[PDB]
Amino acid sequence: LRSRTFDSSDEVILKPTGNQLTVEFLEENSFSVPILVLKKDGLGMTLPSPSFTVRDVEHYVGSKEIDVIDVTRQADCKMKLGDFVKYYYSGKREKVLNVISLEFSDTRLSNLVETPKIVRKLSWVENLWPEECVFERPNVQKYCLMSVRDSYTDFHIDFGGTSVWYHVLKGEKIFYLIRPTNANLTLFECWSSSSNQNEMFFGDQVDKCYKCSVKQGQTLFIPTGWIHAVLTPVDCLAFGGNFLHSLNIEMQLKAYEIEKRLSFRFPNFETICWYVGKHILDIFRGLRENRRHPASYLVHGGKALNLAFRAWTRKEALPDHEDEIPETVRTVQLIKDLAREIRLVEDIFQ
Numbered sequence: 641l642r643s644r645t646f647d648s649s650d651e652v653i654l655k656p657t658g659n660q661l662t663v664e665f666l667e668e669n670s671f672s673v674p675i676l677v678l679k680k681d682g683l684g685m686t687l688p689s690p691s692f693t694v695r696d697v698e699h700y701v702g703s704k705e706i707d708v709i710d711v712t713r714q715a716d717c718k719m720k721l722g723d724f725v726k727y728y729y730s731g732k733r734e735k736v737l738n739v740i741s742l743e744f745s746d747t748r749l750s751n752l753v754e755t756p757k758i759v760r761k762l763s764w765v766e767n768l769w770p771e772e773c774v775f776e777r778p779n780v781q782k783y784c785l786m787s788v789r790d791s792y793t794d795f796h797i798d799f800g801g802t803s804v805w806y807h808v809l810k811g812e813k814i815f816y817l818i819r820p821t822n823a824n825l826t827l828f829e830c831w832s833s834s835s836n837q838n839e840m841f842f843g844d845q846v847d848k849c850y851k852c853s854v855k856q857g858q859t860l861f862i863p864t865g866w867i868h869a870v871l872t873p874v875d876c877l878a879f880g881g882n883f884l885h886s887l888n889i890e891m892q893l894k895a896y897e898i899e900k901r902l903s904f905r906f907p908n909f910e911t912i913c914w915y916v917g918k919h920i921l922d923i924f925r926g927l928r929e930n931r932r933h934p935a936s937y938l939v940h941g942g943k944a945l946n947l948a949f950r951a952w953t954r955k956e957a958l959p960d961h962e963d964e965i966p967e968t969v970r971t972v973q974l975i976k977d978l979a980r981e982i983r984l985v986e987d988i989f990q
């Protein structure tokens with residue numbers, strides 16, 4: 641409804657050029673803060689022209705049951721796309737409706753859009769989800785967002801501890817961003833499992849809340865665990881996607897364990913972790929045999945990953961986690977091997 645007074649993000653949010661946004665760039669900073677890229681050149685995307693409209697979204701997706709958020713009544717419902725488009729172009733919208741969950745990769749719209757290059761290089765699903773396995777591949781890579789003026793999504797952490805990119809093709813979005821310190825995470829879990837949670841503005845409860853506007857042609861990358869709300873001050877059309885990566889594995893697991901203690905979720909999160917575990921073990925093995933040392937974040941990440949592996953497979957917890965373990969993973973052997981590799985890197989006597 642109204643935008644107020646927010647703490648300065650000058651020392652927090654990074655604004656590199658598209659070309660500066662590389663893996664090494666992220667590795668040097670740990671992908672700890674949101675990243676706003678003002679111009680799309682260098683990001684490696686493919687996008688429809690800025691003249692591409694919501695009317696064209698209906699064309700490629702089909703007049704499709706899409707999930708719609710009733711902002712005004714704070715509730716979730718379903719609509720045909722043609723009905724939403726019709727609503728979107730009405731000069732007398734009675735209510736405030738928001739579409740944020742239209743995943744379009746299995747539709748015709750999918751070949752008009754290519755996601756940022758950094759995302760595809762980092763993404764666990766993209767690179768490490770196997771062709772052949774009993775599980776369904778998680779499909780959370782291409783979303784079409786259609787937000788009317790005065791749309792609002794309250795403070796949340798993205799499902800599965802994912803990181804996210806958003807490109808605004810038309811209009812504007814304003815993100816309200818809170819760093820996932822242990823304190824803020826505690827306050828968030830407290831706020832999220834509270835009764836009348838949706839009466840209290842979470843940005844009041846915390847040390848610092850940053851506001852970041854994302855205008856036409858701009859691209860925002862939000863890292864793991866960052867608590868964010870979104871206001872749409874002008875009718876908006878945006879594309880975005882969600883991804884897991886190896887830069888802060890502990891934070892991904894922490895976000896996932898919060899989502900568990902509350903209750904919408906990254907499908908087969910634990911499955912991809914198990915496959916990532918096997919891969920990380922190979923990376924450690926390859927580096928030691930090559931007489932090189934792994935980067936610090938990978939040692940820390942493998943450690944956190946191995947802690948979760950043990951927690952998921954201990955006797956009291958196993959019934960809740962067994963269904964997610966791939967049949968090609970020897971749980972005990974992987975835990976043992978990951979632990980040995982990590983101990984070898986860290987033991988001062990070798």
Ligand SMILES: O=C(O)CCC(=O)C(=O)O
Pocket residue numbers: 738740785787791792793798813868869870871
């Ligand atoms: O665009 C919106 O209103 C919500 C974006 C967001 O933070 C999300 O979908 O996770």
Ligand SMILES: [Fe+2]
Pocket residue numbers: 796797798804868
């Ligand atoms: Fe989000």
